[PDB]
């Protein structure tokens, strides 16, 4: 009888005073962020291989 709870909603929409408003799921939404280390290691790079790379 013990059966789980399982479904992940993408978007959300929820009756704030009438005119209900959609906002996306924060936790679900994927996100990429630039690596700074490697960003600050392209210029000062001494080789063409490395720099280009």
């Amino acid at each position: 009888t013990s059966e789980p709870e399982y479904v992940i909603p993408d978007v959300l929409v929820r009756k704030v005073s009438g005119r209900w408003t959609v906002e996306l799921n924060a936790d679900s939404i994927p996100r990429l962020k630039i690596n700074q280390q490697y960003a600050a290691m392209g210029n000062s790079a001494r080789n063409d291989a490395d720099g280009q790379f």
């Binding site: 059966e3 789980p4 709870e5 399982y6 479904v7």
Partner: protein, 49 residues
């Protein structure tokens, strides 16, 4: 608490070290009777199915 009529005397070892002998009158008079409240809760947990 309640003002119970007590006495200081051994009674056939039933008060050996730290045991108390309670008469049946106290039980009959519903003295020291306690009430407890239990709470149960359930949710629905809407699933995919």
């Amino acid at each position: 608490g309640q003002n119970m009529r007590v006495a200081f005397m051994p009674w056939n070892g039933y008060n050996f070290e730290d045991s108390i002998l309670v008469s049946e009158r106290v039980v009959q008079e519903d003295r020291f009777t306690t009430i407890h409240i239990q709470e149960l809760a359930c949710v629905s947990r809407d699933t995919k199915l």
